[PDB]
């Protein structure tokens, strides 16, 4: 019953009927129904039912989300399903987490964990750490076993930024085949 209700809601949006709000990102202007957005998301719900100026605004803009992504996610809100790949996944997870669509955040997380490779690591441990997906942190560090690169340990330190200069040897778990990693790195790290 509700499935078909959404299926026709989609049509009504695309026919631009009963649309009480326009949301704009950068390029795109998306007409939609306030109550559907409010229903599918806590962000939009708190925005439209709130006592804050946005609720009195017929038009509105959200940032830190690219246009195409926003379109894709409103389309998700209406269609209940979504497409996720390696190109979009990392612009998908933070953007969905912003609008408080959690099932999508979970999607992107699962997709990230699925593709884990000896080289992969990297952003997957960083992203999680910044995007506060904890299961992904645990999964990624439990995935750290005897990597021994100069090159992709390069990947390890490179995207973990500054706080990792702490957490590198702050982690007592590290046991290395070649003990050089403390010196050769630093000057090079200082070189760059």
């Amino acid at each position: 019953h509700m499935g078909k209700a959404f299926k026709v809601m989609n049509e009504l949006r695309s026919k631009q009927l009963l649309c009480d709000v326009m949301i704009v990102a950068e390029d795109v202007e998306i007409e939609a129904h306030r109550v559907v957005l409010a229903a599918c998301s806590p962000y939009f719900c708190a925005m439209f039912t709130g006592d804050m100026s946005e609720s009195a605004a017929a038009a509105i803009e959200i940032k830190d989300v690219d246009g195409q992504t926003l379109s894709k996610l409103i389309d998700y809100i209406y269609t209940a399903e979504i497409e996720v790949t390696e190109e979009n996944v990392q612009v998908l997870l933070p953007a969905a987490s912003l609008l408080q669509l959690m099932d999508v955040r979970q999607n992107c997380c699962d997709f990230l964990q699925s593709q884990l490779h000896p080289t992969n690591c990297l952003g997957i441990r960083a992203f999680a750490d910044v995007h506060t997906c904890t299961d992904l942190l645990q999964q990624a560090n439990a995935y750290a076993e005897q990597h021994f690169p100069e090159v992709m340990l390069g990947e390890e330190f490179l995207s973990l930024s500054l706080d990792q200069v702490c957490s590198l040897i702050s982690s007592d778990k590290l046991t290395v085949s070649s003990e050089e990693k403390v010196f050769e790195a630093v000057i090079s790290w200082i070189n760059y």
Binding site: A46, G50, M52, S53, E54, A56, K63
Partner: peptide, 9 residues
């Protein structure tokens, strides 16, 4: 009222 929700959030 008059506070931007989007901005604060």
């Amino acid at each position: 009222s008059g506070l931007s929700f989007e901005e604060l959030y």
